């Protein structure tokens with residue numbers, strides 16, 4: 048029943064549900080079957096940066112993911128989010144493991160939404176997460192720690208990631224993501240992540256998403272559904 | 281039981297509870313008995329701008345209130361808010377009427393909090409308020425409308441303000457206002473207001489305040505207590 | 514010899530140089546012959562707002578122009594500005610009159626450029642212009658005044674605009690608009706304008722532009738060339 | 747003939763010109779004889795962060811310098827900069843060596859100035875410096891490199907710092923630092939630095955400063971004068 052717009056960093060090819068035959072970044076409009084994808088070389092144990100950009104003028108949801116060595120993947124998709132999202136939303140991060148696993152560690156997260164009419168703005172930045180993060184809604188296995196990081200999916204004491212895990216972090220305050228009379232409705236999101244795995248293959252990935260205010264983890268949305276969708280339709 | 285730090289725009293002299301013999305702006309640390317005040321010429325029916333500034337280095341809570349014609353009042357008070365406030369807070373606007381009354385109309389409100397260590401940031405801006413303002417907590421008589429304004433205290437259909445009124449607006453998300461390891465903890469707040477009264481004297485005023493997350497209007501905090509304090513101590 | 518990327522608010526149809534048969538907004542890549550245009554209802558004597566948005570991910574230069582009554586025109590054009598502009602630029606506003614004329618009054622101008630790698634930023638905002646505006650380069654007839662406005666084209670003492678006029682304002686500091694290793698290079702510009710004319714038709718329009726550092730008004734670039742181009746090619 | 751307001755990170759005690767008997771941070775109003783100082787433990791070879799804060803309401807110039815291990819020094823001084831500085835200024839960084847020496851390496855520098863009336867803003871951020879930094883004015887020995895850093899004072903090929911060196915970096919654009927009608931005139935500056943020395947004692951230090959537009963290195967302002975002052979008065 049949730050409405051989802053997401054950028055997925057998808058570490059695991061699930062070819063039978065329309066994934067390409069490689070790790071990819073994807074734009075997901077109300078379906079895990081990405082509307083557009085690009086090949087992504089996920090660098091095990093390295094800190095990546097994801098950037099997400101939209102404005103209501105160009106009506107183009109863009110994402111780019113890069114690592115320090117400079118290797119980057121970009122994906123863009125033409126979509127009017129006025130026709131997709133509710134006016135009011137929550138913004139969040141989601142990650143899953145299944146049969147295979149990885150750390151889904153968030154080191155930092157920033158977001159900006161603006162409505163310019165004829166301005167209303169929300170901006171937050173986390174470069175360190177604290178134990179009792181009162182402006183975050185933690186769902187499922189997602190924890191904030193003393194190490195200053197957001198662990199979306201459960202990690203063992205020994206620092207090793209665990210399978211069949213799902214967790215999300217949503218910003219506490221609802222966001223006014225569009226308003227019919229806004230001349231420009233724009234949002235930007237950036238997060239840094241550390242995906243590390245000793246597994247034969249890492250899985251399943253990390254998503255930035257926008258949803259209805261009351262959005263919660265769909266039941267059985269572990270693994271390939273990235274904690275966003277109740278099925279693969 | 282609430283902990284309150286406020287800047288009060290006090291339109292009504294209550295001399296028996298330590299108000300000066302004129303309308304004033306005041307810095308209130310856990311008491312309506314302002315720690316410091318300055319004379320303020322409130323201009324009936326005109327749009328004022330209040331600016332509030334603090335940083336943990338100078339440890340000086342400053343406020344200035346001005347009108348378009350340029351007449352301004354300033355008040356500063358040396359205080360370590362690390363020693364006053366809880367780590368996590370909500371920020372809000374409050375206004376009251378009593379025996380005398382005024383419009384307590386907010387046309388715009390912006391806030392920025394930052395912690396710089398060895399950055400975490402929250403920024404919001406409302407230049408228009410909407411009917412269902414999902415990122416605001418409205419308490420008491422406070423309403424948001426189609427006129428794009430926040431009415432802290434009850435106004436009649438005919439546009440006239442009503443007595444014995446109290447309302448507040450708090451931003452939905454808790455704010456991390458200080459952190460022991462922050463090198464610089466700073467906040468800025470700005471709001472524009474229209475106080476108008478056909479009364480013999482306007483009352484009672486408008487406050488920007490910071491409180492515990494779960495802060496609510498103290499019972500009988502109408503009139504001279506500005507919806508912040510349960511008594512005049 | 515200058516390299517120009519501009520958004521033109523074109524009040525006058527010059528049909529013989531590829532203008533449409535109506536006032537329009539246009540994206541100009543190294544030619545006054547706009548790569549893309551949209552019909553624009555210019556509202557005589559009213560304050561308009563222009564917004565310009567680009568990012569190096571979507572590679573889409575977008576502009577929207579609106580007035581308070583809400584009537585707006587939008588134009589978008591897919592272009593890699595890494596392949597058009599020099600790395601370092603100046604940003605500016607330009608306006609012209611010819612055989613016909615108008616006020617080309619700028620009431621406010623803001624700009625933001627960012628490079629995010631694996632951040633460098635420039636932001637300025639003018640909501641009032643002063644007599645000796647030391648962070649602006651004024652070219653041709655462009656003046657700043659006590660009325661707090663930038664007059665791009667010459668106005669008489671009696672407040673009436675004059676024909677065959679050209680003036681520009683460039684921000685003093687060069688801008689690093691792209692860098693080969695930037696993951697995201699983005700810029701946003703906003704300005705408010707008042708075009709007013711008692712003429713049979715207004716002319717010629719206002720442009721936001723990006724150029725080489727040493728860009729100057731091309732000789733004979735009054736009227737339909739908007740002070741940007743030395744010819745209509 | 748220059749007018750100087752500076753925060754000095756002073757690594758070398760020059761006791762005969764009013765330095766305390768230890769490395770210190772200082773607020774300098776038109777004199778190298780700091781109006782106020784605080785003891786500073788400079789950590790050889792470590793990256794420090796300096797923060798500078800002023801607003802025209804509190805009228806308190808504050809500085810804090812810290813290192814990752816959390817050791818920090820703070821100094822505040824009550825001063826009306828409306829009565830000290832010209833309306834228009836340039837902002838910059840300065841460093842010197844003399845008989846003793848150190849690296850005066852700047853890794854990052856950000857600045858924000860705002861005038862709020864009844865807003866004009868300038869903001870820049872350098873987290874990487876490039877070889878041809880067109881928005882910086884380099885004076886004396888100051889160089890920008892491929893290592894992404896600003897070297898205020900001359901360093902040998904072998905990476906060792908050199909004595910009797912002075913260099914400054916000023917932002918290209920003049921800043922409107924105060925305006926008589928501004929309700930709030932505020933500025934913030936942050937820079938990160940790496941001072942390293944194999945010398946018996948490091949010298950001489952790094953300063954953030956504000957000056958007249960046409961400010962240049964005073965002759966013989968190497969060593970204890972930090973490239974800011976022509977004498978020790």
Ligand SMILES: O=C(O)Cc1c[nH]c2ccccc12
Pocket residue numbers: 163164165166562620621640705
């Ligand atoms: O830019 C200005 O000075 C006026 C202004 C503030 N907010 C605005 C939103 C839309 C159009 C104009 C403005």
Ligand SMILES: O=C(O)Cc1c[nH]c2ccccc12
Pocket residue numbers: 396397398399795853854873938
């Ligand atoms: O300024 C930089 O480039 C590094 C940096 C980012 N956030 C900081 C907070 C405190 C000290 C340094 C930094």
Ligand SMILES: O=C(O)Cc1c[nH]c2ccccc12
Pocket residue numbers: 096154155174239629630631632
């Ligand atoms: O986001 C962070 O905490 C680290 C960071 C600061 N500037 C950056 C630019 C690109 C990628 C990561 C960062």
Ligand SMILES: O=C(O)Cc1c[nH]c2ccccc12
Pocket residue numbers: 329387388407472862863864865
């Ligand atoms: O805050 C608003 O909506 C109006 C506004 C924009 N700039 C200002 C500067 C001073 C006082 C009010 C405003």
Ligand SMILES: [Ca+2]
Pocket residue numbers: 057058059060061066251271
């Ligand atoms: Ca998958």
Ligand SMILES: [Ca+2]
Pocket residue numbers: 290291292293294299484504
């Ligand atoms: Ca009172």
Ligand SMILES: [Ca+2]
Pocket residue numbers: 523524525526527532717737
């Ligand atoms: Ca034309």
Ligand SMILES: [Ca+2]
Pocket residue numbers: 756757758759760765950970
């Ligand atoms: Ca010294």
Ligand SMILES: [Cl-]
Pocket residue numbers: 060061062063064271
């Ligand atoms: Cl599968």
Ligand SMILES: [Cl-]
Pocket residue numbers: 277278279280
């Ligand atoms: Cl399924």
Ligand SMILES: [Cl-]
Pocket residue numbers: 293294295296297504
């Ligand atoms: Cl009383």
Ligand SMILES: [Cl-]
Pocket residue numbers: 510511512513
């Ligand atoms: Cl009482």
Ligand SMILES: [Cl-]
Pocket residue numbers: 526527528529530737
């Ligand atoms: Cl023509």
Ligand SMILES: [Cl-]
Pocket residue numbers: 743744745746
């Ligand atoms: Cl021609």
Ligand SMILES: [Cl-]
Pocket residue numbers: 759760761762763970
């Ligand atoms: Cl000496």
Ligand SMILES: [Cl-]
Pocket residue numbers: 976977978979
């Ligand atoms: Cl001397």
